[PDB]
Amino acid sequence: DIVLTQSPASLAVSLGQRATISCRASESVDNYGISFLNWFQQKPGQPPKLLIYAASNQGSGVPARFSGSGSGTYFSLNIHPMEEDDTAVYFCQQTKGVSWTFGGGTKVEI
Amino acid sequence: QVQLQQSGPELVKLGASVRISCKASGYRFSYSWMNWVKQRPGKGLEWIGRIYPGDGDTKYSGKFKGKATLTADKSSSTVYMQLSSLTSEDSAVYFCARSAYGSEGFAMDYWGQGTSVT
Amino acid sequence: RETWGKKVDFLLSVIGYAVDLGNVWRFPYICYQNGGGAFLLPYTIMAIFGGIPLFYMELALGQYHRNGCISIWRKICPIFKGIGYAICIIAFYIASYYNTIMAWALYYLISSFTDQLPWTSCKNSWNTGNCTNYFSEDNITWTLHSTSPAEEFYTRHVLQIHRSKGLQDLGGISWQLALCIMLIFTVIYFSIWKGVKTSGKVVWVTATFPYIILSVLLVRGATLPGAWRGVLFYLKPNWQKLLETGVWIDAAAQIFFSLGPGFGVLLAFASYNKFNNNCYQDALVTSVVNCMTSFVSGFVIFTVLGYMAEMRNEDVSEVAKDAGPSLLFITYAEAIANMPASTFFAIIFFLMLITLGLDSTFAGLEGVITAVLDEFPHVWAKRRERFVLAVVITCFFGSLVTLTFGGAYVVKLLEEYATGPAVLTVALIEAVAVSWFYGITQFCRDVKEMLGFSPGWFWRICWVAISPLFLLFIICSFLMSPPQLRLFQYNYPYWSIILGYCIGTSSFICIPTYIAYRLIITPGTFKERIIKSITPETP
Ligand SMILES: *[C@@H]1O[C@H](CO)[C@@H](O[C@@H]2O[C@H](CO)[C@@H](O)[C@H](O)[C@H]2NC(C)=O)[C@H](O)[C@H]1NC(C)=O
Ligand SMILES: CCCCCCCCCCCCCCCC
Ligand SMILES: CCCCCCCCCCCC
Ligand SMILES: CCCCCCCCCCCC
Ligand SMILES: CCCCCCCCCCCC
Ligand SMILES: CCCCCCCCCC
Ligand SMILES: CCCCCCCCCC
Ligand SMILES: CCCCCCCCCC
Ligand SMILES: CCCCCCCCCC
Ligand SMILES: CCCCCCCCCC
Ligand SMILES: CCCCCCCCCC
Ligand SMILES: CCCCCCC
Ligand SMILES: CCCCCCC
Ligand SMILES: CCCCCCC
Ligand SMILES: CCCCCCC
Ligand SMILES: CCCCCCC
Ligand SMILES: CCCCCCC
Ligand SMILES: CCCCCCC
Ligand SMILES: CCCCCCC
Ligand SMILES: CCCCCCC
Ligand SMILES: CCCCC
Ligand SMILES: CCCCC
Ligand SMILES: CCCCC
Ligand SMILES: CCCCC
Ligand SMILES: [Cl-]
Incomplete structure (x- = not known):
């Protein structure tokens, strides 16, 4: 399996501040131009919800607040317009071969 | 719209076995994978395995290769999962996420309500 | 009576020679691009x-x-x-664009080692989308923008074309094909390292399995439902497309590519080990056997295409609309995907295809090595090693543009721009030269002296005004008609025609260059120089 770890542990919720979440993909490469990696969001007591797929494209029913960037090994997420509603846990799953595994998850709470 | 439901709560008995179903509807059944994740109370998500409807492939994560049995049924489009040798550790919530239509391979956000066993 | 003595004698020996790639892959694609049936009559004419x-x-x-x-x-x-020099440049362009099909076949054979063939389903193996696998076993409807798993596989795994938006924007270089083309070039270099192959025993072992496996594939396609709908499309007269369409250029290109004249392979492979040994009875039989093999291959391809069209419930000429040289790796893949022993038969078919491609490319690269040694025997005829390696490196460096992500956009360009008009004008020039400058009477007397039988009235009139006039008319029709193509929802840019005309000119410009250069070294006036350069050199 492909080991995927997240460097951050916990952020601070603040109005009008940028949040940066990165996943470690030291053993990973792009196959056909699209990065096999997804971004999820799971609220406390709610099932997980798709946020950003392929790290570049926006999912279904997601506002323009979350914007993904990066390719290859390092990835990033832009949560610049963070309000009091974006308090949840974001995971990081890769879909390269049979290696589907999630990450540690970073909860945001001030 | 693509509806996706699951079964109700169950009881984890020492040495017994359970069966969790996942009835999907609203799109092509035998065209996308059916993921199965595990989430312990307090801990994070944990992938178990995948199954493609149509007797094509059958994959697992590596830690549930002997405790999970994914069974498909194209008659009613209800994917099953039979666990074996349960214990006090397998008491978690099992979801049912439908994979994408190929290249992207992401979750189509059609997740179930969760089968919280106890 | 039906003695069949002609089929009895010399056939088991001639059938082992006419085995090239220009009849199993080039003929079906050309025939389907211009419509079956309406191409066979102009082809044979x-x-x-x-x-x-x-x-x-x-x-x-x-x-x-x-x-x-x-x-x-x-x-x-x-x-x-x-x-x-024109023949050398044409062969260089060939070896630059001909090895791509060999690399694709080798990659297919490598990827066809698992028990589950990737061309059966597209259940998100590597990169898929908008798939339709269940043709009639599940009885589902067919809609627009639907592609079979074979086409998606060929377009997304062996030739990644989605990375490049067109010919004007070429991506990187796929190492998965370079690692195979390097092995192919190494095997080719290890076979012509000495250049001693006249009557080896390898022909009787590399020409017997291809024919039996082709007959097995033929009977398998014939035992497949939906085959009768493809036979009628392959045997339709269609006199409309003969009158004013312009199919003679493709037919002439296929003929000059499958037969051998134009690439200098005959004059290089026949100038040894044979002298006055039953002439006039070998070329006709070889051409007949090659035409029969080409017809059998086209019949098998159209038999598979008929079933493919009957499964999709669409027109026969609408299944592969913009598909070019990919007609083999799709129809043959879909045909093998329904056989009982799919993996073994696929491996055997790819192995025989690779061996046939190797045997066909060993003669193309040989017509240039033995040609330079006859003009400069004081420097290159002694080494025999530093020249073949140099030409292999040159052909490999020139075969890197076709290995790009836009491979289908480069192979389709050099297919009818570097082989169609160039070989045609080279053959026309050499034929008119041998006819008029050398003299038809001298050639006839030499043939009578070297064989003991003068050519008939049909042969003495062909090289005079039958073949040269036809070649000139075809060249004029090709130059006056736009040869613009179309492939994968992107026909071509505007500068593509100019690029093709420039590619087809650099190979032909050598003849006028040498014409204008030879008249400078020889002294005297214009008429004296012409008279001195017309007579051949004396030993
Ligand atoms: C399968 O479906 C996809 C999604 O509609 C098709 O992709 C698009 O192609 C059509 C024309 O073929 C365009 O009009 C759309 O704008 C394209 N979509 C996007 C997002 O660019 C695809 O062509 C279909 N067929 C296949 C993949 O063979
Ligand atoms: C597709 C196979 C075509 C074979 C065509 C063979 C043509 C042979 C022509 C022979 C002409 C002989 C003329 C003799 C005149 C005395
Ligand atoms: C991973 C196994 C690779 C095997 C490659 C075999 C290549 C055979 C080439 C034969 C050319 C005639
Ligand atoms: C999928 C990767 C296939 C690699 C095949 C390599 C075959 C040997 C190449 C040797 C090059 C010198
Ligand atoms: C009708 C278009 C003619 C284009 C001619 C381009 C130049 C041809 C000669 C190139 C020599 C290198
Ligand atoms: C298959 C069509 C062949 C036409 C030419 C036949 C020539 C027969 C010997 C004169
Ligand atoms: C940008 C267009 C590049 C075209 C290259 C054609 C190469 C043909 C073989 C030398
Ligand atoms: C990413 C580019 C990979 C290129 C592999 C072939 C290199 C050949 C160098 C001569
Ligand atoms: C269903 C019709 C099959 C016809 C096969 C013809 C084979 C001809 C071989 C020369
Ligand atoms: C097109 C080049 C040949 C033109 C005719 C030459 C005739 C030479 C007769 C001796
Ligand atoms: C209508 C006349 C077109 C003439 C085209 C000539 C092209 C020569 C390329 C070498
Ligand atoms: C175009 C090929 C030139 C070969 C020169 C060999 C000396
Ligand atoms: C001695 C083998 C040389 C192979 C060269 C491949 C380009
Ligand atoms: C050798 C030709 C076999 C034809 C079989 C048709 C069913
Ligand atoms: C000995 C290597 C020769 C390379 C020639 C490249 C044109
Ligand atoms: C875009 C890559 C071009 C390679 C050219 C090699 C001669
Ligand atoms: C033997 C010469 C024949 C010339 C024919 C010209 C049409
Ligand atoms: C249908 C074209 C026939 C050409 C005959 C040339 C002699
Ligand atoms: C490429 C043309 C060269 C003409 C002179 C050869 C010695
Ligand atoms: C066709 C080229 C003719 C050159 C003549 C130079 C005197
Ligand atoms: C092929 C008959 C002549 C067309 C111009
Ligand atoms: C044929 C390319 C040059 C070799 C010396
Ligand atoms: C059909 C054109 C002929 C020019 C000689
Ligand atoms: C017309 C070309 C002359 C080269 C010396
Ligand atoms: Cl042919």
């Missing part, structure tokens, strides 16, 4: 008109003069010596 006489003339020249395509003109016409 152009063949009987200008492919057998030129074949016999090249064979006689190679048997009598016994020299390479660069040294042949030293005893016929010193002015038209640039034909050798």
